[PDB]
Amino acid sequence: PQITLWQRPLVTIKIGGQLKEALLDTGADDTVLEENSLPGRWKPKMIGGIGGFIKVRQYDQILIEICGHKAIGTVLVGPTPVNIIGRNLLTQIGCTLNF
Amino acid sequence: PQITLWQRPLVTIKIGGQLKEALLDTGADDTVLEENSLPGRWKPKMIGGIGGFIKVRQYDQILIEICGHKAIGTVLVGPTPVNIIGRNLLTQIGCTLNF
Amino acid sequence: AAXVX
Numbered sequence A, B: 001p002q003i004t005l006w007q008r009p010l011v012t013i014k015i016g017g018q019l020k021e022a023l024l025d026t027g028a029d030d031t032v033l034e035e036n037s038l039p040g041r042w043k044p045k046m047i048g049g050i051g052g053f054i055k056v057r058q059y060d061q062i063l064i065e066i067c068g069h070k071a072i073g074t075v076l077v078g079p080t081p082v083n084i085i086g087r088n089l090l091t092q093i094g095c096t097l098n099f
Numbered sequence C: 001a002a003x004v005x
Helices: none
Strands: A008-013 A018-024 A032-034 A042-046 A054-068 A069-078 A096-098 B010-015 B018-024 B032-034 B044-046 B053-065 B069-080 B096-098
Touching: A042 A069, B044 B069
Parallel strands: A032 A069, B032 B069
Antiparallel strands: A008 A018, A008 A054, A042 A054, A054 A069, A096 B096, B010 B018, B010 B053, B044 B053, B053 B069
């Protein structure tokens, strides 16, 4: 579909047998989800945003279903106020900005 | 135009006689620009992002030219690593997400 | 890196 920006662009994601809502964020190079129970190995990593840097855990080869669209990629888990779908993923689902 | 997300969506903005580059951010409710010399009165305000809260100054009725498209609205000035064009503005220029 | 407000 087509999302206008009068309200936040929130969408249903299915990650590791769990259902969540995430914001489609063109302003994010990466996808960062709040602490969820995800299986596999992960490494320590740090991402910056507007007030600072938070340490997250990177999980590679993670399968996600964004609004029914499947994609595989890097997913960062940490203390984010919201589940963010970033550029690494948006490209997989052929998402563009039009104006 | 149409922006694919292989690279960050950066665009030329013209604000108060100055030329800048800004990121089109669907993940932002507001537009926050780095400290620039803007005339008028402003109030203290705070915005949160992924590492915390930063205090900014709100300027209302600010004219901006986003990729040649004029719009008027609220603009927040503060210590952001990047000039962000948020939802308040994206709607004015008829910007949508498609996939 | 990555959401304002």
